[PDB]
């Protein structure tokens, strides 16, 4: 017997105490270390309701990345309210790690192990663990990098999609590399590659799941219709440094429907940018120019975030657009499977 | 899209009494919002999520429903709770429902003003006919000079219902230019309503 | 306690387009979506998209999109940072984009859902017309003869709205009717105020109407007497 509860987590983690990479020094000071033989039980004859949109876990995830960010990386200026800081603020190394959560004694964690799970409602075949497995605090808008794929199909999740103000994770179930390089030797441009006939695929698997769940209606990309540019360009940092890539060529409708030329590289225009718009909310950053050298991080795509257009429509298409912005969807879309009960 | 089909379009009852007003969705299985909307002030939240009631609303209000078909319910009716209410779901919004006072039938009294010689110095007719405190607001006013009807030259306000002995008062103008308005002689205007056994006319003769 | 405070209403000419500002206080303006929605005369409610002030997403409704633009500015008083103003700037209005507008936003509750719009400012009127501004002509309805009588003021042809109307400079109101205006195919505003007064009086009492139209500077004192 188990209830539905919040609870206060633990973290583990195998960070090296020896490191000066600023994840393994959070880690080091907030998480213990992780279980060599975890249990994890199938609990049979069970089923059990989730809401990946609704989950505590999610909230305590969010404190901690923040927590992690506001320790470690601190700008030159600091812009907030109408108000002026001024710190040092070091180049630093930069590169997250795997972090569990776990329950204390008392509580325990239900984890839905059916494979299309969408993120809510009952869940037929179930299990029990001390903790989730090891998550990556990746801060990224437009695309989700270095996270974990979908099962068997690609899966849709909202917590509603008739709600046109919620949303979208598309959780792929086959990476996409994205290459992103500022070379040695204008020390501010970078550029992303793709491989075009990779990406184009998954995009096309794409736009069919959303068929699924929207009536067979047309399935269109259109741009982001306003906002910062953390928000309307594919945003990442990057070996600490902040990257912006222009994520156009990405959502190119022209591929997907059925031409041809769209096969090979795509290389997205970027910016590394050292004046930024804070993801925690606290406002601007200045940070000091980049490093020198060939700053390189090739990621997967895992994950697409994306809002859909609403209004007095009744079209033959829906319309989507790169977006969402909420860091906490980042964390959603890894601890869906995932609630926290107590025992007794 | 949700298209959002309120009805009655209004409602007469007297304070005290329960409305009931309906809301039906061309999709089943959302969550049902409300508002409320009193003349000439700001829209207020009554109900979302189907059931729920929104800050500082009293309990008398009760909403409800399911699948389509959706329902406010109004009770012990207070004096404020006479306005017009919308349904809501996402972006998506009903035409609205009147509720409105609900009293004995009362006859207009009905006058009819002729232009005044400053006015047609000028080049234009208007002549006016006032249908005041009369209940319901429903009312057929026709003009009708030298006893052909007039159609597409007049044009009807009405006022808000009255706070206090909850009657109406329409006005209708007849507009004319000045040379129409010297070919003719006889002005009417007939008013049918439910108050009065059969119409009623008030005329005068041009220059008389 | 949440406040969301819009700018006036205006007069817009056709091929303008209008800024509205609305200021909302009392909590984390970066915590909540601001929205806009739009009510128009004889056809209801229309959303017209939202805004997340953190980055400034935004979603504008499919058949507003080209026309519509969302924009947001925070706070910068280093006391009070927590307030901010949202704007939506609508362009190429026509007369049928004459409606009151409206800033929302949602209710703080566990239930509460985005489009529940527990908060509202204050409306913004809306008016698009190609009218110049113009004073009204006053003319009298005359009372034609116990039994009681009517007579009026007819006030007409003046644009913007609103005019307001007084008998014997506010010492008459009862039985005083002052109907909406009415939007004449010139363009140009009209209405009338009656009252109904005893026969008896027709003789004994003087009714003058007081009628005031600031946006053209124009104040009339009208005399009405029996025909
Ligand atoms: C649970 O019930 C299923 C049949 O519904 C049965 O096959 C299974 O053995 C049961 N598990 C136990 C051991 O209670
Ligand atoms: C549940 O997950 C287990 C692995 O943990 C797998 O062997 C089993 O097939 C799954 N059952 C269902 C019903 O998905
Ligand atoms: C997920 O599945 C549940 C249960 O079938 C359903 O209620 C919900 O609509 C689904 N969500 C999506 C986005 O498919
Ligand atoms: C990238 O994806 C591959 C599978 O396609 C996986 O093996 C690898 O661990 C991923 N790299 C990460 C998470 O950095
Ligand atoms: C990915 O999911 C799609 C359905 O959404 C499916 O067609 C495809 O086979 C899947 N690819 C795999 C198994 O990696
Ligand atoms: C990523 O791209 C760079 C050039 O921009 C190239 O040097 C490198 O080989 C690429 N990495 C991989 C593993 O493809
Ligand atoms: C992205 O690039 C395209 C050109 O391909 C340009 O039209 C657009 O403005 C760019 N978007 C942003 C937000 O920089
Ligand atoms: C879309 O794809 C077509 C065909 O490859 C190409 O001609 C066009 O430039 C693309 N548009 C972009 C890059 O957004
Ligand atoms: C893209 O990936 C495909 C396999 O999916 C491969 O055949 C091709 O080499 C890649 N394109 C380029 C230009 O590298
Ligand atoms: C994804 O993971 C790899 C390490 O496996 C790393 O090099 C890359 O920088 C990561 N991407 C991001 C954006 O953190
Ligand atoms: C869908 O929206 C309704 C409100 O219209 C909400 O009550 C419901 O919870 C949403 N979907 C789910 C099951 O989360």
């Given at each position: ?8 987590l633990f973290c583990a983690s195998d960070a090296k105490a020896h490191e000066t990479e600023v994840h393994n020094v959070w880690a080091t000071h907030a998480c213990v270390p992780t279980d060599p033989n975890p249990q994890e039980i199938h609990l049979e004859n069970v089923t ?297 | ?208 | ?227």
């Amino acid at each position: 017997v188990w209830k539905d509860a919040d609870t206060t987590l633990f973290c583990a983690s195998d960070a090296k105490a020896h490191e000066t990479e600023v994840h393994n020094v959070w880690a080091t000071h907030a998480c213990v270390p992780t279980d060599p033989n975890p249990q994890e039980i199938h609990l049979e004859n069970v089923t059990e309701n989730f809401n990946m949109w609704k989950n505590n876990m999610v909230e305590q995830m969010q404190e901690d990345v923040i927590s992690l960010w506001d320790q470690s990386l601190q700008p030159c200026v600091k812009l907030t309210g109408g108000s002026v800081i001024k710190q040092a603020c070091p180049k630093i190394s930069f590169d997250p790690i795997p972090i569990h959560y776990c329950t204390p004694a008392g509580y325990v964690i239900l984890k839905c192990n059916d494979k299309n799970f969408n993120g809510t409602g009952p869940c037929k075949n179930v299990s029990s663990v001390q903790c989730t497995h090891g998550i990556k605090p990746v801060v990224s808008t437009q695309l989700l990098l270095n996270g974990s794929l979908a099962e068997e199909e690609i899966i849709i999740r909202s917590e509603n999609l008739t709600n046109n103000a919620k949303t979208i994770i598309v959780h792929l179930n086959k990476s996409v590399e994205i290459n992103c390089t500022r070379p040695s030797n204008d020390i501010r441009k970078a550029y992303c590659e793709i491989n075009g006939t990779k990406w184009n695929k998954v995009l096309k698997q794409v736009t069919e799941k959303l068929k699924e769940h929207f009536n067979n209606k047309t399935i269109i990309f259109q741009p982001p219709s306003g906002g910062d540019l953390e928000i309307t360009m594919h945003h990442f940092n990057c070996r600490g440094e902040f990257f912006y890539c222009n994520t156009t060529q990405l959502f190119n409708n022209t591929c997907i429907g059925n031409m041809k030329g769209c096969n090979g590289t795509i290389t997205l225009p970027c910016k590394i940018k050292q004046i930024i718009n804070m993801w925690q909310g606290t406002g601007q950053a200045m940070y000091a120019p980049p490093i020198d050298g060939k700053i390189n991080c090739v990621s997967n795509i895992t994950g697409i975030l994306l809002t859909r257009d609403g209004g007095a429509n009744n079209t033959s298409n829906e319309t989507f657009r790169p977006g969402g912005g909420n860091i906490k969807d980042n964390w959603r879309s890894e601890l869906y499977k995932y609630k926290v009960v107590q025992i007794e | 899209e949700i298209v959002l089909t309120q009805s009655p379009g209004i409602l007469s009852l007297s304070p005290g009494e329960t409305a009931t007003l309906f809301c039906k969705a061309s999709q089943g299985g959302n969550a049902m919002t409300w508002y409320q909307k009193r003349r000439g002030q700001v829209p207020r939240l009554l109900i979302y999520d189907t059931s729920r009631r929104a800050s500082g609303v009293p309990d008398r209000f009760v909403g409800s429903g399911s699948g389509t078909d959706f329902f406010l319910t109004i009770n012990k009716l207070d004096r404020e709770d006479f306005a017009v209410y919308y349904c809501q779901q996402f972006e998506f919004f009903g035409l609205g429902s009147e509720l409105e006072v609900h009293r004995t039938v009362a006859a207009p009294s009905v006058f009819i003003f002729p232009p005044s010689d400053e006015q047609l110095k000028s080049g234009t007719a208007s002549v006016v006919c006032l249908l005041n405190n009369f209940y319901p607001r429903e009312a057929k006013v026709q003009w009708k000079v030298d006893n052909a009807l007039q159609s597409g030259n007049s044009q009807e306000s009405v006022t808000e219902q009255d706070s206090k002995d909850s009657t109406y008062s329409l006005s209708s103008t007849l507009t004319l230019s000045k040379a129409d308005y010297e070919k003719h002689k006889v002005y009417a205007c007939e008013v049918t309503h439910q108050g009065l056994s059969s119409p009623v006319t008030k005329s005068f003769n041009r220059g008389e | 306690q949440v406040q969301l405070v819009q700018s006036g209403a205006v007069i817009k000419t056709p091929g303008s387009s209008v800024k509205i500002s609305c200021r909302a206080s009392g909590y984390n303006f970066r915590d909540y979506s601001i929205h806009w929605v739009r009510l128009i005369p004889d056809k209801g409610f229309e959303w017209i998209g939202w805004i997340k002030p953190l980055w400034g997403a935004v979603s504008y409704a499919r058949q507003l999109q080209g026309r519509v633009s969302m924009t947001r500015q925070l706070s910068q008083d280093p006391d009070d940072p927590d307030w901010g103003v949202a704007y939506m700037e609508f362009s190429g209005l026509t007369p049928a984009d004459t409606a009151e507008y409206f800033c929302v936003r949602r209710g703080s509750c566990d239930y509460c859902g985005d489009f529940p719009w527990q908060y509202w400012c204050q409306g913004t009127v809306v008016v698009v017309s190609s009218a110049s501004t113009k004073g009204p002509s006053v003319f009298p309805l005359a009372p034609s003869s116990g039994g009681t009588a009517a007579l009026g003021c007819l006030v007409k042809d003046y644009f913007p709205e609103p005019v307001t109307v007084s008998w014997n400079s506010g010492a008459l109101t009862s039985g005083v009717h002052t109907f909406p205006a009415v939007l004449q195919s010139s363009g140009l505003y009209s209405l009338s105020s009656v009252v109904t007064v005893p026969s008896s009086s027709l003789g004994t009492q003087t009714y003058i109407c007081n009628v005031n139209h600031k946006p053209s500077n124009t104040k009339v004192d009208k005399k009405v007497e029996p025909k």
